[PDB]
Amino acid sequence: MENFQKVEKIGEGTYGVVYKARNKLTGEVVALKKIRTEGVPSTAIREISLLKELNHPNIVKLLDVIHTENKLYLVFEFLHQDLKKFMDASALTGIPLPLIKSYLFQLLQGLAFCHSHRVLHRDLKPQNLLINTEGAIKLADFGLARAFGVPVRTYTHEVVTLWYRAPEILLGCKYYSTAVDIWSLGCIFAEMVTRRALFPGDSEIDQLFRIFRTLGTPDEVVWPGVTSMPDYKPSFPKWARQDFSKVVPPLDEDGRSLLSQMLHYDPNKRISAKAALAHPFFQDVTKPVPHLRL
Numbered sequence: 001m002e003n004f005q006k007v008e009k010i011g012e013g014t015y016g017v018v019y020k021a022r023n024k025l026t027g028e029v030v031a032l033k034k035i036r037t038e039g040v041p042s043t044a045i046r047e048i049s050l051l052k053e054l055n056h057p058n059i060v061k062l063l064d065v066i067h068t069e070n071k072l073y074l075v076f077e078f079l080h081q082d083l084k085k086f087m088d089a090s091a092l093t094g095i096p097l098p099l100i101k102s103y104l105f106q107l108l109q110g111l112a113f114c115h116s117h118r119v120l121h122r123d124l125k126p127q128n129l130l131i132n133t134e135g136a137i138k139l140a141d142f143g144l145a146r147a148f149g150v151p152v153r154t155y156t157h158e159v160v161t162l163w164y165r166a167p168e169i170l171l172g173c174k175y176y177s178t179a180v181d182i183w184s185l186g187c188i189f190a191e192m193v194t195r196r197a198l199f200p201g202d203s204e205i206d207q208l209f210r211i212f213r214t215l216g217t218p219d220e221v222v223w224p225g226v227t228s229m230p231d232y233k234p235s236f237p238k239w240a241r242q243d244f245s246k247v248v249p250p251l252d253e254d255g256r257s258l259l260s261q262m263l264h265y266d267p268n269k270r271i272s273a274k275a276a277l278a279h280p281f282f283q284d285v286t287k288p289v290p291h292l293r294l
């Protein structure tokens with residue numbers, strides 16, 4: 001597009017590159033995503049257009065959609081970094097606990113807002129949570145995820161990650177719920193306290209068996225229905241559930257209560273965003289600022 005000085009490339013999305021740009025109309029700085037090519041479908045457009053009205057402090061704002069002859073451009077507010085890089089920088093340290101539960105609390109607000117309008121994200125992961133220098137964190141690629149996608153390669157042939165994918169999706173359910181995003185957020189929570197990914201699978205069945213080694217192989221008592229799932233196999237090994245105080249040391253007890261409720265197998269039993277926001281863990285939630293290099 002012509003009203004946009006492209007300043008810097010700042011990434012490979014699942015759908016396209018992202019540039020930092022200046023809007024030469026308004027003088028604003030912007031993240032410009034440039035998606036696909038021919039010929040982009042009606043339904044993608046109609047869906048994505050109306051994301052312009054899904055606004056909240058913790059969703060990154062979608063400023064405009066441009067469809068031109070024949071790519072899609074999405075232009076977003078600009079945030080200076082993502083969670084994965086901040087975790088890598090905080091490696092010897094760990095993000096402080098106050099800042100962990102601040103971020104978790106904000107994401108959990110952003111999620112409750114989306115789920116009250118029945119939109120799922122469904123591909124939540126550290127690199128599409130975006131942070132600023134004032135201490136906010138925001139959900140990016142909301143609704144894109146399942147307007148186009150999710151491919152197992154991106155447009156760069158990059159493998160998309162499995163690490164945060166809920167088990168009902170791995171077991172081949174078509175009609176999953178907002179509980180999907182709660183599973184993912186819980187994996188990310190554990191990765192912040194431990195500084196290590198919780199379930200770093202490198203295929204679907206590896207991913208799936210890594211969950212089983214830690215939470216036990218699921219059955220009909222803990223999850224009614226499991227046994228009927230498309231990709232369930234009688235022949236799955238049966239591991240026993242691990243004691244939860246070694247999975248996420250040294251979270252305190254309120255942190256492990258919350259985590260395990262976000263990681264229940266049965267997606268009807270795991271906790272909602274709304275309900276999570278009432279959990280005792282957030283009794284003393286602060287608002288830390290990351291101070292940050294930029």
Ligand SMILES: CC(C)(C)Nc1nc(C(F)(F)F)nc2ccc(-c3cccc(N)c3)cc12
Pocket residue numbers: 010011012013014018031032033060076077078079080081082085127128130140141
């Ligand atoms: C597509 C993907 C979600 C992977 N990434 C990003 N998407 C968008 C958005 F606004 F276009 F969504 N804006 C972004 C803004 C900044 C960054 C960014 C910039 C510098 C360092 C790191 N680690 C991430 C990544 C972004």
